[PDB]
């Protein structure tokens, strides 16, 4: 789950990067 998020903290980046 650990690198789990890491995936999604990575695809949310953008996500964030966005707002």
């Known amino acids: 789950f ?3 998020x890491l995936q999604g903290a ?5 996500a964030a990067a966005q707002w």
């Open 2 to 4: 650990a690198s789990a």
């Open 10 to 14: 990575a695809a949310a980046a953008p």
